[PDB]
Symmetry: D2
Subunit: 393 residues, 4 copies
């Protein structure tokens, strides 16, 4: 419960560097120098750091300034050994992206935004990032009439497929991860959840290198079960990255420490990333990225406390989830409840639809009332998970 | 604002026949005979009626009883001319489906449930239904540990692909529509929204004849924009059916009359079904199905009032949405706001990613501050839509 | 973690007795005989039992049937030693109550509902109940014009003042507890949250013996912090009873076991009930009542299992919350965050507004930016708390 | 639909002046000079203007700067005739207020916050404001152990009683209006809803001149019915001010124009404000204040457009709500649904509880099932209302 680099905890530069400006107030902390960020995270046990183009390099920066910033940064990474596993672009802060990057009603802003992305892919390759995240935060509307809904999706597809074709063309070993979000900053964002995101990728021409980057808080903002949406992404072989934080209900994006929102949910999230599926199946072996914000009420000691907290929470949940699954009481409760039974195909090997229709024991002579008497024992099984969680077993 | 059969208003037998039992009380109305339902709906201007297998035919019914019920029903349809455009199966009422049909932890219940579906497909063909709806209402969990998340999806796929292969095999001209729902009756349902549903179909073997059946209320239960989710379904060419009702917020499934929930949203929903996309694209020309419930406080006069209300609301919204789009002030407001501009591809014909990166006017020499000065005028445009809605223009 | 009568765990007859019918399906369990409920609950460690008049005595019961049923139930209580601390009135399942009891639009119904309550006060008094709970579940509307909102609150007051007047008159030592609920079964219910119930009580003629019965899931259905709510009820000394359960978000009411919802909020509710306020103040001493429903997926072993899960959940939280406040590291963290500092009055002993305004050091020469440097360290206090919750420290 | 000063449309300086910075981006508009705001608003038909102390006078303003600024603003008011009906205090943007003003854990900060309020009361009185608004935006927490909840309410009371005491002492005719808000910017805010604010007021020493300022979007953020909320405030005669805007669901605060959110609820709020209660009762006569923000996508033409949209929205709703209640068909529908019947007291003139209980016809021989046959016809009353809303009848 001391993190180490094979744990693969990655942190975004914008998280610990978030100085505290919210919509009702100014920053409460001084800016965090990025070299200092790299040194402080390496020391806490982080494996890597991620950033947005404008997190390191100002929008305004001249070529010389860009060279100077990147040199110090590269030096810092070298001194520490921190990797840079994911890179992303800021397509939401400057006033020009008031109506989006890629789905901006203005065509000249869509070309600028797509060029901001291609340049960033080149920097992403250079850094040795394996994933390029795309968070379309300003793509949407506040009013139903603001957009042509089909055009938005065509413009979004265009953007994404041009970027993907460009990776392919240059031979970069980079994958694109789209990060779905319900709302905020727009009152409605395009591809609001994990399924919209997932569905969207199947319409792309270069879909093969496009996957997702779900975020705890984002699904929770539409009241979805985070464990069930990552399950589906994994199931489809599209869980390319993951962002973990906490959220307490449907409200503004809180960005708390992982485990400080919905704890029981955090627990089962960690059981799926760590243990996978009960009957076997896919596993996610990428980085465990923390995309959160150190509460504005706290000074810099709280920033480093908060960074430590993320990794601690994940490790506490991991031991509890490993003991839980190892527990023989839990394994037999799982058996009773039919967890392993769900793993069995419904049809017998070689059985056809006509075969089952016509099988008298599966329908005509099936006793539905007897079958309804089964005690699934889901509460008891729920109860065992929580007793494991509470460290009482 | 007198409905007629080319309007294609279809009503489910369970809507007007809903006698009023909620989780806190008993029915407040007497049962509605299904022949009387057909006669009363034909007379109100409905085009068709839909039903769940157990809405017409009791679970218990002997073959003779099934023959007798279907004969009277068929007679009624013949006497009136009402079609039966969609059929669906009850996989959620009997105690046997306490943990689902298709994703039931018990394998014997999954075989029964799939056989209940194949038999129903045969009845669906017989009735001349073009769509077979599948609402997986009991597929999910209340506890994160109740299921093996990957197995659930494999079991769901198995069910759905067996049913689809069986349509194909028998040569029925029937399509399957899955209806996504966030929650209720389960605390979390599998394929909770339109994207999960959409994503899910791309993993199926018989995906080609599988599409969606979104419902106003269902998306609204996860706080999504209904117009933007049907837009995406349409965009993907998967909007096979549609269910319209009203819902006032994130809470239990209310099932109000279309236009009695979120009115402005209802309005833009009707603008998309009726007018389509501003720059052109797909159109939805299937039935406009009302899946709602006549409030339990009201007697039978309210049931028929409520049925009339659905069609009235849709026709009032339709005229307001046609005037709105015809309005030359509105067309020029759309132009200013860049609604048509979104229709233009981002890249020039023949332009490549390298071409745009390297185009100095799109990036390097792009004036982002000048571009940020643009007045999108989205509020004014929103305001014009509402003045059209209020019948003030 | 073995409950004893000393713990004051009370259960509603309706909870273990809930047979499984929900809006989409029939009962999955057989009716529970009340004598068995009493016997079962006494073997688990329950302190008492509570009921609604129609949980015990059927709506259409003859006089002979009523006495048999009470002879049976009084015998059971006598045999087992269980107490009956609370009694409530079912003003919701019979179709007569579709528009409410007390705020029904029909005056004849308001008279019957209130008659039904007065008779029930006699019964409650006879049983030795100390609390009389009023849950106005059908009090509200689906539509904004259905009700005259000032007249609904006048009617509500009349009902509550008549019942309280009657208690005072008859010399019964009963206190009325109003149970606020935002929705379900009505689309909007009168006196939606703790706040609303408390405000209403202050408009009552006999508000001195009228307080609240907050329920965990009801407040979570509005997105409110359950703990902030009962704190406010406590502070006004109006916390007369409490109903504990689980709710996983804004959706239908789940009625999960306590701690099977929002764990961390459950942990903080236990802390408040057990440890009181950090700086002292009123404490809650009534029954810890569980109003939940055994999931319908579970048979009768599941029912006694979930009844036991309420009590184990609570005892495990209590143990952690006691360990939490006793930790010296936590006591120190609390001092550091200003938790005890909030207890010191803002003004000085006999300081006036005018004295405060001209004091130079409090305003005029107050260094606002120096003050703003304080690291409140709330993340670290939060992290310690979860660490005590997880049985880690 | 041309507003006139007689309409009492008031606007906050912060609303038209909002420059566009949100959590994900910088300002998209230039600062608005306050003199121009005053002039612009008087040309649109505004009756008055309201501000926060720091909207006008910068936090670090010298004495010389403060007088210049007030000379400029007083001149503008004089020139245009605008009134200043409400003044409020910014106890939220400066980093000193990260934990609150009045309920900050730091005692030195509580003293400065209250000093800052007292000084602002003098200013408000000087300006001729009738209402003093208190919005405790930083009063709350992200974490359940950050605060002693009884001590936070004691501190809050001290602050409000000190300010009210001061008003009384100085002979100013100002009334305090507390503005409840459930969240944002804190994860949970003290006095979350109308209900909570009203309950708190009754625990105050000087609660007689302390009332509420409900805001439309704040209540919709909890899923509450805005109309039920102000009705309850009205009924207790505590509706001192109102803030009108739009909110599309439980998500961040949108601050859309009034009627650009939930239309039908907007329609029913106008009806209540204009027509009062169907059976009579208190009526609201203060300013109709708009606290919204011009979407950041819109330039300055958009700003004056949205200021005008507030007033047109309201005037269009008012016209429909007046037409609605005057319709004979609607008056009849209301009688039929029992709307006036709710106004008749339940008991008879000098009827006691005891008299009611033994009356055979009210209980004992009351035919509950005959009573339950009444068709309340709420769907048809709702349908008439939407038809008047849509300018259809
Ligand atoms: Mg993220
Ligand atoms: Mg449906
Ligand atoms: Mg309760
Ligand atoms: Mg406000």
């Amino acid at each position: 419960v001391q993190p180490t680099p094979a744990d693969h905890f990655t942190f975004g530069l914008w998280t610990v560097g978030w100085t505290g400006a919210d919509p009702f107030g100014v920053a409460t902390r001084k800016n965090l120098d990025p070299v200092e960020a790299v040194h402080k995270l390496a020391e806490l046990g982080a494996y890597g750091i991620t950033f947005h183009d404008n997190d390191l390099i100002p929008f305004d920066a001249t070529e010389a300034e860009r060279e100077k910033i990147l040199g110090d940064f590269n030096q810092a990474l070298k001194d520490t050994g921190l990797k840079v596993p994911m890179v992303t672009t800021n397509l939401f802060s400057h006033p020009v992206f008031k109506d989006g990057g890629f789905t901006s009603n203005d065509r000249s802003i869509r070309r600028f935004a797509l060029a901001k992305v291609l340049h960033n892919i080149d920097l992403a390759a250079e850094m040795g990032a394996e994933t390029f995240v795309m968070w379309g935060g300003r793509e949407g509307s506040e009013y139903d009439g603001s957009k042509d809904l089909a055009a938005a999706l065509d413009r979004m597809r265009e953007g994404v497929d041009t970027a993907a074709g460009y990776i392919k063309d240059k031979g970069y070993n980079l994958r694109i991860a789209l990060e779905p979000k319900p709302n905020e900053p727009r009152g409605d964002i395009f591809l609001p959840t994990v399924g919209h995101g997932l569905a969207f990728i199947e319409q792309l021409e270069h879909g093969d290198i496009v996957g997702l980057n779900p975020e705890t808080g984002h699904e929770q903002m539409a009241g979805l079960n985070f464990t069930h949406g990552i399950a589906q992404a994994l199931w489809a072989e599209k869980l390319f990255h993951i962002d973990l934080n906490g959220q307490r209900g449907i409200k503004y994006d809180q960005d708390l420490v992982f485990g400080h929102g919905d704890l029981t949910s955090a627990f089962f999230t960690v059981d799926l990333l760590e243990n996978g599926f009960p009957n076997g199946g896919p596993k996610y072996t990428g980085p465990r990225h923390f995309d959160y914000k150190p509460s504005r009420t706290d000074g810099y000691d709280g920033v480093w406390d908060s960074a430590k907290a993320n990794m601690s929470m994940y490790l506490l949940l991991k031991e509890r989830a490993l003991a839980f699954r190892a527990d023989p009481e839990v394994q037999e409760a799982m058996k009773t409840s039919g967890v392993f039974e769900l793993g069995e195909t419904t049809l017998n090997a070689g059985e056809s639809a006509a075969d089952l229709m016509n099988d008298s024991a599966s329908f005509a002579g099936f006793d539905a009332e007897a079958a309804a008497e089964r005690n699934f024992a889901f509460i008891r099984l729920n109860q065992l998970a929580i007793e494991h969680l509470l460290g009482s077993r």
